[PDB]
Curated annotation (Swiss-Prot):
It comes from the Eukaryota. Ubiquitously expressed. It is found in: Nucleus; Chromosome. Residues 16-122 form the Bromo domain. The record marks N98 as: Acetylated histone binding. The chain holds residues 44 to 167 of 1362 of the full protein. Transmembrane segments: none annotated. This is Bromodomain-containing protein 4. Phosphorylation by CK2 disrupt the intramolecular binding between the bromo domain 2 and the NPS region and promotes binding between the NPS and the BID regions, leading to activate the protein and promote binding to acetylated histones. In absence of phosphorylation, BRD4 does not localize to p53/TP53 target gene promoters, phosphorylation promoting recruitment to p53/TP53 target promoters. Signal peptide: none annotated. The gene is BRD4.
Length: 125
């Protein structure tokens, strides 16, 4: 079955607003979210519904853009790099579970390319 989704709130962690964090939500995440190939990445992989029973045997650090969006909205991240790492994990997981030429892999490649173009103009710390 599925694990619970990743935590999107931490009550023992302080919160701050930064130029970088605002950009990550309003520019980076927003732009990826609206991409034609965003849909497989907008929520946790539902392995039960999709009948992918080995998915969470193979992927022990799942991540998705729905989670990332909620983390940003909830001020879950203190440092911008925490958010960037989550995107990286999300992409890397595809390359672990799937094979070259799989639809999902081509979709990940397009999103990652876009992600890098957007992170390029990330405001300074
Ligand atoms: C191909 C499986 C997969 C998805 C995915 O989500 N595929 C998906 C979702 C649904 S759906 O019913 O849940 N659905 C309604 C359309 C989405 C809102 C239906 C069919 C699907 O192929 N994502 C990732 C990262 C993977 C990986 O294999 C990654 O290693």
């Amino acid at each position: 079955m599925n694990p619970p989704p990743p935590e999107t709130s931490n009550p023992n962690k302080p919160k701050r607003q930064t130029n970088q964090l605002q950009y990550l939500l309003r520019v980076v995440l927003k732009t990826l979210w609206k991409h034609q190939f965003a849909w497989p990445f907008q929520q946790p992989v539902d392995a039960v519904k999709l009948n992918l029973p080995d998915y969470y045997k193979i992927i022990k650090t799942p991540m998705d853009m729905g989670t990332i969006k909620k983390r940003l909205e909830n001020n879950y991240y203190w440092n911008a790099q925490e958010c960037i790492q989550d995107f990286n994990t999300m992409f890397t997981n595809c390359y672990i579970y799937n094979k070259p030429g799989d639809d999902i892999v081509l979709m990940a490649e397009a999103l990652e390319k876009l992600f890098l173009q957007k992170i390029n103009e990330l405001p300074t710390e």
